[PDB]
Amino acid sequence: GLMQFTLPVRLCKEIELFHFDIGPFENMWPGIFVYMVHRSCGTSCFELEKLCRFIMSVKKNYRRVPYHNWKHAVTVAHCMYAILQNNHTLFTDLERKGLLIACLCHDLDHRGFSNSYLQKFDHPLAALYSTSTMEQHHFSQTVSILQLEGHNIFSTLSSSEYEQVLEIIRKAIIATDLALYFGNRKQLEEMYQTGSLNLNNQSHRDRVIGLMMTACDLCSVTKLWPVTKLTANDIYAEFWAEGDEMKKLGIQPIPMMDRDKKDEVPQGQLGFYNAVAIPCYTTLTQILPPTEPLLKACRDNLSQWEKVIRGEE
Ligand SMILES: CCCc1nc(C)c2c(NS(C)(=O)=O)nc3ccc(OC)nc3n12
Ligand SMILES: [Mg+2]
Numbered sequence: 351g352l353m354q355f356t357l358p359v360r361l362c363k364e365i366e367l368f369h370f371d372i373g374p375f376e377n378m379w380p381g382i383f384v385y386m387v388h389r390s391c392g393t394s395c396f397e398l399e400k401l402c403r404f405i406m407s408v409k410k411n412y413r414r415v416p417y418h419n420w421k422h423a424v425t426v427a428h429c430m431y432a433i434l435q436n437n438h439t440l441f442t443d444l445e446r447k448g449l450l451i452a453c454l455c456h457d458l459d460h461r462g463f464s465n466s467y468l469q470k471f472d473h474p475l476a477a478l479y480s481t482s483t484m485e486q487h488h489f490s491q492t493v494s495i496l497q498l499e500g501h502n503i504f505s506t507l508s509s510s511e512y513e514q515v516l517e518i519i520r521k522a523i524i525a526t527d528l529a530l531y532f533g534n535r536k537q538l539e540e541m542y543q544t545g546s547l548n549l550n551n552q553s554h555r556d557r558v559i560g561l562m563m564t565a566c567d568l569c570s571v572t573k574l575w576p577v578t579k580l581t582a583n584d585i586y587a588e589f590w591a592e593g594d595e596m597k598k599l600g601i602q603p604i605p606m607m608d609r610d611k612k613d614e615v616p617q618g619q620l621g622f623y624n625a626v627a628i629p630c631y632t633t634l635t636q637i638l639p640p641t642e643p644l645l646k647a648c649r650d651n652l653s654q655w656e657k658v659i660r661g662e663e
């Protein structure tokens with residue numbers, strides 16, 4: 351219980367910042383996650399033997415895909431750690447515990463393909479889960495790993511608390527379905543602006559936690575320009591593979607996913623920043639003012655993508 355993780359000084363300091371990059375050393379990422387748990391939650395939240403064994407089972411069930419991989423999992427967990435640390439009195443003990451685990455597990459066993467591709471392929475998961483297909487699978491894989499012998503990091507919780515935390519994780523992971531994001535943010539926008547938003551209302555908390563999950567999940571748009579620019583190559587590599595597989599089914603993919611139309615990437619990016627990312631961090635900043643650095647960094651990067659379109663770089 352007196353065993354803390356420490357990081358080297360540059361990491362110890364930079365990890366507190368929203369725009370932190372977890373680096374290219376895979377073997378430090380589990381330590382980075384435990385560090386964040388111990389500062390965000392407490393050193394008693396989880397039994398270290400169980401946490402370490404949960405983390406390495408989760409890692410093992412991320413696939414070697416260009417973007418939706420173990421590095422994404424830990425990156426999205428760090429963004430949630432930054433939001434929680436900057437807003438530390440707004441969230442319960444259970445929410446701090448649940449949300450970091452939810453972010454680490456939110457893309458478990460992702461294959462690099464969208465819910466639409468699974469559906470057009472007629473993948474078995476699409477018959478099992480008619481909506482939020484991959485996201486119901488991610489939650490399912492989470493529960494699977496929790497029920498492995500020695501992996502139940504929630505074993506010290508009461509019956510009620512256990513059921514609450516699994517319900518926090520389920521809604522948190524389902525909210526990473528971008529199809530649900532548009533309506534969720536619209537409702538929050540309305541609630542904030544008419545003054546009706548109330549964080550003691552569980553259905554309002556749910557929506558706000560949903561928006562936090564979207565903000566963490568898209569946090570690659572909030573990094574320093576060189577990180578954001580290079581992450582775009584990994585995202586587009588999955589898009590083009592999915593476009594290829596669409597063509598193999600006899601379906602012309604949208605232009606964003608067609609590797610024969612790579613000149614129309616910079617404009618595909620702009621639409622995504624204006625329709626999804628900017629509104630997401632704007633509404634989030636309105637509800638959680640300390641999350642403003644995410645909105646500012648997102649705007650800085652939109653400005654960098656506009657430059658790329660003009661041929662200024
Ligand atoms: C994986 C789909 C969701 C997603 N997450 C991120 C971080 C991005 C992103 N960022 S970047 C680093 O600037 O390329 N660009 C995207 C462009 C289009 C798009 O259409 C769905 N999604 C994008 N996206
Ligand atoms: Mg996902």
Ligand SMILES: [Zn+2]
Nearest residue numbers: 422456457567
């Ligand atoms: Zn994700």
